[PDB]
Design a protein around this nucleic acid. Structure first.
Ligand SMILES: [Mg+2]
Ligand SMILES: [Zn+2]
Ligand SMILES: [Zn+2]
Ligand SMILES: [Zn+2]
Lengths: 559, 85, 65, 141, 49, 196, 159, 133, 263, 43, 168, 114
DNA sequence: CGATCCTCTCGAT
RNA sequence: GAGAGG
């Protein structure tokens, strides 16, 4: 395992990673010191002799340079020590171990490598500073973030090895994945957030900014689109300027809930010939979604065009947002005086439901359903009332939040946060659970020595009435910490356990491959499937389609 | 022994992604090593971009030997293989 | 460890104000907020500079070598 | 004088503890909507009372401002990192020959402190700075 | 500000980590799992301090 | 990191003029993303900031102690009393442009910690170097100019990509690769290599 | 239970049905109880479906099982991946586990099995039984530093 | 080209609906009983109230990189107050003789219903909307 | 006179509060940035440490030394060393400062910016003298000494711009606001019940007419009237921070005009 | 340092869990992620 | 009805509609024969396998069954004419686009599907949050899930935690 | 360690030139100007002035990467009008505005007391 | 006989 | 071997 199946290798490099709005999807930012340590062995041909001479002349310390010149016999000339290091008249057939240069294919990776998308080929872009820079929309396959993460780079040392990386492993080739027959890369964070904000019917742009936004798109035709508005001032909509980033012959149709071709809510999506007709652009259109812009553009225009679409959208949106601004403060967690009153009463009614049920259980009136205990029946009821309360209180909070609420804004775009988050920060944290039950009696007949014995009340068994805004009481604080711990303990287990599963799965199926007869066979030549997937289709070239003859009435079918 | 004749070939008339990559790689290696070029390079210098051109104009003189699980093979020329992809 | 010269955020010179601040607090028996304002430390970036400073140099000067 | 007393978990089992002196035992006979919700007396057979609930916390977590306003694992995370934050580990640093030492040029005491920090000598030997922070989408970096 | 509580062994500052163990001389009864021939077990781990 | 489990690295540095600014000409020492907030539910961070702004403004120490009756409403009263919008929001102007940002930014002081773990102590690159005695494979670790491990899991991804040559190159040309002499009869590494 | 069933007009209609949920298993006996639909009886004990209904029903039930673990997590994986797993566990006519007991004891190459678990003991019985290894597997080629018959090397290149 | 459609409308409803600059207008023609119009307008640039009588025109001329007004001597088909530009995206036939046209002016939608649109309202990337009084 | 207009509201040695009208925001901002980053100044760019028995590190001291404001009045009569034909530095391109301090007293000995001694030939140029705004005339506490303690060092103060290092900023905060009433609608205010009630009124609102509710939006309007206040560190008088700011910007536009000529 | 000097170790039914009885004795927050989660404690 | 299949017919149709600038006012130039035979011949050209034998011809017939269902439902006379309103030009282009995209969609011999499958199942399993199921309401919903269950399945555990019969 | 020198923000490298004029490939009478060792200070100011010119059809600037001082300026002008002349007038207009400001501030400053 | 990956640093034999 | 990092 440690020496044959895996081993430490030369032409490898490692560092802390950083994001780069100004980097192409298929690129990787290489620190100059790394580009200078890592080399490629280039043969001296008439097609490169001039460039190689200059690189040898630059030597190992100036960037587009080289260390080592290998001649016939195989003798390595050390460019940092040789007395003839400034002489060297190259000959064809010699090799120059040149520095890693812009556009070289490199294998970029983040451990754990659970995916083939965890190990992809990028185009080198030599940069100042000591981190590896990467396009934000490649963060997901690697499952990378910039909180201290490190990544590894591998350098192909052969022409065929570079072809393998560029023709099989390249980032654009991986956009649409066979794992879930859909893209594994999409518009995220700031870009996902600003693309929504830009797309509002209300969002309008003036000439000055429009011109700058248009120029920010490298594939731009140079033609200024006619402004949506031509009356007191030419005014372009956000949808208009973002459509410049979308190539022609791109068609997309959606329909969410109330979408009606006149799209009252500006929901759904309609793109004709790469021009957005209606529909606020968010996660459903521009994320890792099944039939979105990205799945469509890859299939329609191709992987190379799709990888440009990442940058193009990033460039416009990042610029517009840089100029617009986006924040979040304590004020975004605050709901109305009246909302709070309603939340407060929502909880007190839940508190009474639990009392009534308790009083009833204690009177021997509560009958247990077939299959479950009277006490199990009680616990089930209490927890429902208590969960209902958190959900009802939370929904009360969410409704009160204005469209200008920054938390609500991030939820609408689908960039960060869900309902729970709003509810727990603004309304009520809710019931704490350990081993799927409410807080257990760790002391005799009580959860804490601040309670009396035999107390089944919400507060007693871990119900956090307060929100993170209001703040938690010591009892509530401790119980939340108990619930919290169960999470960290299984996180720690559901990593070492899943890692072992993954190994076993990989080892058992290692040798299964598609043969020249469309058959699925192991190393013995034994048949697993007669046709791969039963249809002999590649998973990355497949998408969810409606079978129109199956549904509807017999009359509808006839019509 | 073993071999399938040209007439009786049942494998895809299409070049696989794995075939194209290995083809382009092998040819790139040759060009990189001062081997003769079968097409007019129009300001082209990268061995791979040249192999891509030789592939596009069907001037790669290589043959893919397709092994079937019993051991029999189907010889297909780069010349005959359709390049969709 | 000694008053930073200049506020990190804006660049306002603060390194000439420490001793005057200690005096304003001790001798004039003023509160930190009015002491800061008398020094002309109007913005909060300049205010955090002085109010938040811990003068460990005094502790260090106590070591006999 | 028997005003205070030591208790282990075994003895904790036989006793009833009030969480606050006042806010747990004066008498009964308006509210701040902003303030958190507190249950009540609901038990009045106390033998003991907590010196101060913040004492349930140890050294690291005692540095966190308002941990009662944070999702619990974040407090566990902070507890880890506080030990990786450079400050002025000891006043005599200039005299010791440690394998590795990291000292902040200008340590600053935090503008937001805990009552427990007085006893942890935090404002005397701090490990951080009061940076002016903006929460914003700027260049996307 | 040094708090002590540690040792200096060959110039190295050593901390003895508090070791958690079960207290001895405590009687504890346990329900033994279904296939077991013994329903319940009462145990005492008798120590001499 | 702030004292709330909010760790991160520097993506870039900007000089004062590129930085967004307040109308009093206050500029941030740090810019953190709004996205780091909703899911983490690290509200104390936002409360720390609001409190700290009032503290620097008033020359007092903020009481960020746990189980208290200190409220966001209470701090907000004091913040407004200082002539600032009560929720820490401030009108900011773009550094490149001078034009007001459409959005108002939550801005004020927050205690940040400089952690160990610095790029320069982590960067490592190897293009050939020292080999282990036994295995004849690259040495381990940055300190010894070691090679990075291309483990089984990585070997697996190269199989999935179908990169047969790259996988061979990693395991041979990079790392070990040795020429042994084999007997045609017994098929063992018996052969007495008497080269030259 | 909710149930999508075709109505007399053609469309699918929600028609709820009473379903019994058990703790414990006796497929063979319960399936013969009058009043049930022995055509629709199910168990999450795919080993029992295998023993009563056969390997093919065992396989279908094994997919349903794997599928449900993935689906309960809200995740979606393409059919072909879980199908391949389930088929591999199935092709022997029984249920072969993804364990040193299961797949690792099969007729495969000694150098490929030793790469997983029980390394030395696999290699000892290989010598004693005087095994031949094809070197047709990925692992033996990784051990040999040879181009494996995977993608790129799954064919030969000639002139 | 020239005008494709011209009429006077009586505005029934004006709804803001979660926007600050935009309002969706509900209006019927003063001449034709079947003639309807639903339209998104920038009320910041051109305010509209209920019962307002507006002249609406769909024209197609007064194409390449848009050049700044440069009114120096530049004269356009505007004796109007509010002018848009958009795409014909749908032609829904609401039975017998009733036809509806859908126009998106940079995402500010419009639905014009009647019958007589016939040999005039083409499926063009073109269409200028011109509103006055 | 013609284009841009100035109206000085407040003025002192340290600050200028002024209204900049009949100007474009691109100009107001470019001017704003130039005062921060590009006006040349004199600051310590080299320290040679002879003796340091101080409690502080050589480089820690050297850092603060560069941060001391130095007279930069006659800065244009000093060369950038990089352009100077000398080997290293000289009186045409640098100012040399001396620092010798010893702990004579049992009580703590403080080291100030007043203790640096100009050792080079200033040739009658008003340059290099540490800026002292202190009432006690000490200015900037560099260091503190105990009894046996000593610090002996030599400084080379060179010409530079904040763009290279912040120590070269004649800078300090630049208060900058336009349209205090949000008539331009350049910002959409965040509110709970009432943006007017919730956002504090700008002092600059007195100097402008309120929008008036019964009026339609002024879509054609553009920002021209910038309420500014330039704070000076000391090295250069306020009037100069602005005048040299204008001069520098003017200069860098001229270098473009001259570049077009050259090609 | 203070933390290290107030640290607990537990070699090897549910030991990783913050038990009720830990109240006021061992910190609810301060425990290592993954590795010794709940096995290493702090007073 | 919604199932993952190769070749997005809806998209191809939409592309012919724009490429040929179809006017929903004029009558088509097509014939029932053009549509009916056209679609029929298209089906004889969707190759997954190629052998001239019966075993292979029926295997081919089988592989393409569900796609031919989708195709027939989408390319029926009334749909092509009333719904899409295609011309002969647009129709013939669609016919060739389906064939070309179908042939592109086929798996390439050499594809390492074992490792693919393993990683495609394994990766999500690592992302499986909570060992305890979110069915916290009712106590009779207590069936083993997540990673503990996935382990029961893979190890083929004779002694599972939650054996259960579901009786219809 | 991999940090560039700070003088690289404002000092031309050997080989580097202030302006580099490239004819635009996408449109007639359009030009792209790369300005080396200059940021938003010059870029915004110039772009704004070019829009003040009625014979200027397009004017936009961008700083493609924050690491590097350089910016790119795109100018499209009226048939007959050269983009280099448009850039010239824009520059002189700025210089004359700046001259006017200097004097106006100096005049004001002299009237002051403190 | 199994018991995530990879990465770092430290001290001691 | 322990401490740590994602
Ligand atoms: Mg991370
Ligand atoms: Zn300041
Ligand atoms: Zn032999
Ligand atoms: Zn000189």
């Amino acid at each position: 395992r440690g020496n044959l199946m895996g081993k430490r290798v030369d032409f490898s490099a490692r560092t802390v990673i950083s994001g780069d709005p100004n980097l192409e999807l298929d690129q990787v930012g290489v620190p100059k010191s790394i580009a200078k340590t890592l080399t490629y062995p280039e043969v001296v041909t008439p097609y490169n002799i001039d460039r190689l001479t200059q690189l040898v002349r630059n030597g190992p310390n100036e960037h587009p340079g080289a260390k080592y010149v290998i001649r016939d016999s195989g003798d390595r000339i050390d460019l940092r020590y040789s007395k003839r290091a400034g002489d060297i008249q190259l000959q064809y057939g010699w090799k120059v171990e040149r520095h890693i240069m812009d556009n070289d294919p490199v294998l970029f990776n983040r451990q754990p490598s659970l995916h083939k998308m965890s190990m992809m080929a990028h185009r080198v872009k030599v940069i100042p500073y000591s981190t590896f820079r990467l396009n934000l929309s490649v963060t997901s396959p690697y499952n990378a973030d910039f909180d201290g993460d490190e990544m590894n780079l591998h350098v192909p040392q052969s022409e065929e090895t570079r072809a393998e990386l560029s023709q099989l492993c390249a980032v654009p080739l991986q956009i649409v994945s066979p794992q879930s027959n859909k893209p594994c890369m999409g518009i995220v964070q700031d870009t996902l957030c600003g693309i929504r904000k830009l797309t509002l019917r209300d969002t309008f742009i003036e000439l000055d900014q429009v011109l700058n936004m248009l120029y920010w798109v490298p594939d731009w035709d140079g033609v200024i689109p006619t402004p949506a508005i031509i009356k007191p001032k030419p005014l372009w909509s956000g949808k208009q300027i973002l459509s410049v980033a979308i190539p022609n012959g791109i068609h997309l149709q959606r329909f969410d809930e109330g979408t009606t071709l006149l799209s009252p809510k500006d929901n759904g999506m309609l793109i004709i010939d790469g021009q957005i007709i209606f529909g606020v652009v968010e996660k459903k259109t521009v994320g890792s979604s099944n039939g979105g812009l990205i799945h469509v553009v890859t299939r329609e225009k191709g992987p190379q065009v799709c990888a440009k679409l990442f940058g193009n959208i990033q460039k416009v949106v990042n610029f517009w947002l840089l100029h617009n601004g986006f924040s979040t403060g304590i004020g975004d967690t605050i709901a109305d005086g009246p909302t709070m009153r309603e939340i407060t009463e929502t909880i007190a009614e839940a508190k009474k439901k639990v009392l009534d049920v308790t009083k009833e259980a204690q009177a021997n009136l509560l009958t247990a359903k077939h299959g479950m205990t009277l006490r199990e029946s009680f616990e089930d009821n209490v927890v429902r009332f208590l969960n209902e309360a958190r959900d009802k209180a939370g929904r009360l909070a969410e409704v009160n939040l204005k469209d200008l609420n920054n938390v609500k804004q991030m939820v609408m775009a689908g960039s960060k946060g869900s309902f729970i988050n709003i509810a727990q920060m603004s309304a009520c944290v809710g019931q704490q659970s350990v081993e799927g039950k409410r807080i257990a009696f760790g002391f005799v007949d009580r959860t804490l020595p601040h309670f009396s014995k035999d107390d089944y009340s919400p507060e007693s068994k871990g119900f956090v009435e307060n929100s993170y805004l209001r703040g938690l009481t010591p009892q509530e604080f401790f119980f939340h910490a108990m619930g919290g711990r169960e999470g960290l303990i299984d996180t720690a287990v559901k990593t070492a356990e899943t890692g072992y599963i993954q190994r076993r799965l990989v080892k058992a199926l290692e040798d299964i491959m598609v043969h020249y007869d469309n058959t699925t066979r192991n190393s013995l030549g034994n048949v697993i499937q007669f046709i791969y997937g039963e249809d002999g289709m590649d998973a990355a070239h497949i998408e969810k389609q409606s079978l129109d003859t199956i549904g509807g009435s017999d009359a509808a079918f006839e019509k | 022994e073993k071999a399938i004749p040209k007439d009786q070939r049942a494998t895809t008339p299409y070049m696989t992604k794995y075939e194209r990559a290995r083809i382009l790689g092998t040819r790139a290696l040759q060009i990189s090593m001062n081997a003769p070029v079968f097409v007019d390079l129009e300001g082209e210098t990268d061995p791979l971009r040249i192999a891509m051109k030789e592939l596009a104009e069907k001037k790669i003189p290589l043959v893919i030997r397709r092994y079937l699980p019993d051991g029999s093979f189907e010889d297909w020329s780069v010349e005959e293989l359709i390049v969709d992809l | 460890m000694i008053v930073p010269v200049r506020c990190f955020s804006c660049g306002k010179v603060v390194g000439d104000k420490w001793e005057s601040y200690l005096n304003l607090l001790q001798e004039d028996e003023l509160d930190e907020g009015t002491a800061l304002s008398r020094l002309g430390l109007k913005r909060y970036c300049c205010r955090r500079m002085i109010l938040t400073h811990v003068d460990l140099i005094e502790k260090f000067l106590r070591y006999n070598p | 004088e028997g005003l205070v007393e030591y208790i282990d978990a075994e003895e904790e089992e036989s006793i009833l503890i009030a969480m606050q002196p006042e806010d747990l035992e004066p008498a009964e006979a308006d509210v701040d909507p902003a303030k958190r919700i507190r249950v009540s007396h609901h038990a009045t057979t106390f033998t003991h009372c907590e010196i101060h609930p913040s004492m349930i916390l140890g050294v690291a977590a005692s540095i966190i401002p308002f941990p009662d306003h944070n999702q619990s694992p974040r407090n566990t995370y902070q507890s880890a990192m506080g030990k990786q934050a450079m400050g002025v580990f000891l006043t005599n640093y200039n005299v010791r020959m440690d394998t590795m030492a990291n000292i902040l040029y200008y340590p600053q005491k935090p503008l937001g402190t805990t009552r427990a920090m007085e006893y942890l000598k935090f404002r005397e030997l701090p490990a951080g700075q009061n940076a002016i922070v903006a929460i914003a989408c700027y260049s996307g970096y | 500000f040094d708090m002590g509580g540690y040792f200096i062994i060959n110039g190295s500052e050593k901390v003895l980590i508090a070791q958690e163990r079960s207290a001895g001389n405590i009687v504890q009864v346990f329900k033994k799992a279904a296939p077991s021939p013994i329903s319940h077990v009462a145990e005492i781990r008798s120590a001499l301090e | 990191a702030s004292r709330h489990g909010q760790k991160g690295t520097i993506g870039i540095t900007y000089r004062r003029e590129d930085m967004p600014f307040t109308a009093e000409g206050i500029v941030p020492d740090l810019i953190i993303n709004p996205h780091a907030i909703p899911s983490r539910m690290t509200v104390a961070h936002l409360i720390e900031c609001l409190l700290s702004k009032v503290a620097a403004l008033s020359g007092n120490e903020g009481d960020a102690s746990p189980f208290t009756d200190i409220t966001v409403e209470g701090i907000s009263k004091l913040l407004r009393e200082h002539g600032y919008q009560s929720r820490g929001f401030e009108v900011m102007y773009n550094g490149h442009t001078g034009k007001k940002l459409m959005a108002q930014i939550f801005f004020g002081p927050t205690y940040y910690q400089r952690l160990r773990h610095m790029v320069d102590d982590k960067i490592h690159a190897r293009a050939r170097g020292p080999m282990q005695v036994l295995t004849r494979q690259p040495v381990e670790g940055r300190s010894r100019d070691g090679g990075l491990r291309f483990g089984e899991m990585e070997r697996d991804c190269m199989i999935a990509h179908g990169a047969a040559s790259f996988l061979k190159e990693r395991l041979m040309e990079a790392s070990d690769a040795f020429r042994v002499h084999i007997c045609g009869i017994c098929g063992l590494m018996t052969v007495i290599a008497k080269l030259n | 239970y909710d149930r999508k069933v075709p109505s007399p007009t053609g469309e699918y209609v929600k028609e709820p049905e009473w379903v019994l949920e058990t703790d414990g298993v006796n497929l063979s006996e319960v399936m013969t109880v009058p009043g049930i639909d022995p055509t629709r009886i199910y168990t999450n004990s795919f080993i029992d479906i295998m023993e009563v209904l056969g390997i093919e029903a065992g396989r279908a039930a094994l997919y349903k099982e794997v599928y449900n673990v993935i689906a309960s997590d809200g995740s979606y994986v393409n059919y072909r991946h879980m199908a391949l797993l389930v088929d591999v566990m199935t092709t022997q006519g029984g249920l072969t586990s993804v364990t040193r007991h299961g797949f690792n004891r099969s007729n495969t190459g000694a150098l490929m099995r030793c790469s997983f678990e029980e390394t030395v003991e696999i290699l000892f019985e290989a010598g004693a039984s005087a095994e031949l290894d094809d070197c047709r597997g990925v692992s033996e080629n990784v051990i040999l530093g040879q181009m494996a018959p995977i993608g790129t090397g799954a064919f030969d290149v000639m002139i | 080209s020239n005008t494709l459609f011209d009429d006077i409308f009586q505005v029934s409803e004006v709804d803001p609906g979660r926007y600050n600059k935009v309002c969706r207008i509900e209006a019927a023609s003063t001449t034709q009983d079947q003639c309807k119009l639903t339209l998104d307008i920038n009320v910041e640039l051109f305010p509209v109230a209920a019962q307002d009588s507006l002249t609406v025109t769909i024209a197609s001329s007064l194409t390449r990189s848009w050049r700044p007004p440069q009114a120096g001597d530049r004269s356009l088909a505007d004796d109007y107050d509010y002018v848009m530009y958009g795409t014909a995206y749908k032609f829904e036939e609401v039975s017998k003789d009733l036809i509806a046209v859908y126009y998106s002016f940079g995402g500010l939608l419009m639905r014009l219903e009647g019958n007589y649109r016939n040999l005039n309202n083409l499926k063009q990337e073109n269409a200028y909307l011109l509103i006055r009084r | 006179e013609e284009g841009p207009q100035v109206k000085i509201r407040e003025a002192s040695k340290d600050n200028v509060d002024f209204i900049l009208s009949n100007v474009d925001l691109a100009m107001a901002n470019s001017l704003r940035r130039v005062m921060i980053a590009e006006i040349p100044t004199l600051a310590i760019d080299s320290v040679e440490v002879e003796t340091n028995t101080t409690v502080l590190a050589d480089e820690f001291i050297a850092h603060r030394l560069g941060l001391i404001p130095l007279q930069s009045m006659d800065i244009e009569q000093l060369e950038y060393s990089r352009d100077c034909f000398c080997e290293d530095h000289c009186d045409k391109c640098s100012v040399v400062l001396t620092l010798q301090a010893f702990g004579e007293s049992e009580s703590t000995t403080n080291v100030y910016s007043k203790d640096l001694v100009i050792v080079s030939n200033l040739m009658g140029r008003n340059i290099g003298h540490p800026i002292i705004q202190d009432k006690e005339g000490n200015g900037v506490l560099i260091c503190k000494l105990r009894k046996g303690q000593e610090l002996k060092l030599t400084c080379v103060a060179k010409k530079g711009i904040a763009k290279e290092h912040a120590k070269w900023g004649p800078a300090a905060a630049i208060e900058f606001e336009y349209d205090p009433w949000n008539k331009l609608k350049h910002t959409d205010y965040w509110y709970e019940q009432d943006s007017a009630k919730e956002w504090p009124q700008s002092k600059n609102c007195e100097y402008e007419d309120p929008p008036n509710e019964g009026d339609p939006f002024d879509y054609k309007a553009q920002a021209d009237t910038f309420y500014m206040n330039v704070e000076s560190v000391g090295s250069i008088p306020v009037d100069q921070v602005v005048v040299r700011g204008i001069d520098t910007l003017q200069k860098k536009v001229a270098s473009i005009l001259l570049a077009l000529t050259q090609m | 340092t203070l933390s290290h000097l107030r640290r607990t170790n537990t070699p090897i039914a549910k030991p990783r869990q913050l038990h009720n009885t830990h109240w006021g004795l061992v910190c609810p927050a301060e425990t290592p992620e993954g590795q010794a989660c709940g096995l290493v404690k702090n007073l | 009805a919604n199932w993952p299949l190769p070749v997005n017919i809806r998209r191809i149709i939409q592309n012919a509609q724009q490429t040929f600038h179809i006017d929903h006012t004029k009558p088509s130039d097509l014939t029932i024969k053009d549509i009916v035979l056209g679609v029929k011949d298209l089906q004889e050209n969707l190759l997954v396998l190629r052998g001239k034998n019966e075993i292979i011809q029926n295997a081919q017939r089988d592989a393409v069954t569900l796609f031919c269902c989708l195709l027939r439902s989408r390319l029926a006379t009334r749909r092509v004419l009333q719904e899409y309103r295609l011309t002969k030009q647009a129709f013939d282009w669609v016919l060739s686009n389906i064939e070309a995209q179908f042939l592109r969609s086929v798996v390439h011999p050499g594809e390492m599907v074992g490792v693919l499958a393993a990683q495609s199942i394994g990766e999500p399993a690592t992302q499986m949050t909570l060992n305890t199921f979110h069915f916290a309401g009712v106590a009779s919903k207590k069936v083993t899930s997540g990673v503990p269950r996935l382990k029961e399945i893979l190890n083929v555990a004779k002694n599972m935690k939650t054996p259960s019969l579901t009786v219809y | 360690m991999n940090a560039p020198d700070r003088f690289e923000l404002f000092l031309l490298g050997e080989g580097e030139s202030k302006l580099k004029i490239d004819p635009d490939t996408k449109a007639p009478n359009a030009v792209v100007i790369t300005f080396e060792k200059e940021d938003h200070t010059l870029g915004n100011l110039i772009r704004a002035e070019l829009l003040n010119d009625r014979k200027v059809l397009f004017a936009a600037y961008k700083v493609e990467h924050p690491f590097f001082a350089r910016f790119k300026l795109r100018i499209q002008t009226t048939e007959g009008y050269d983009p280099k002349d448009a850039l010239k007038n824009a520059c002189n207009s700025i210089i004359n505005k700046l001259g006017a400001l200097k004097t106006n501030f100096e005049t004001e400053w002299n009237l002051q007391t403190l």
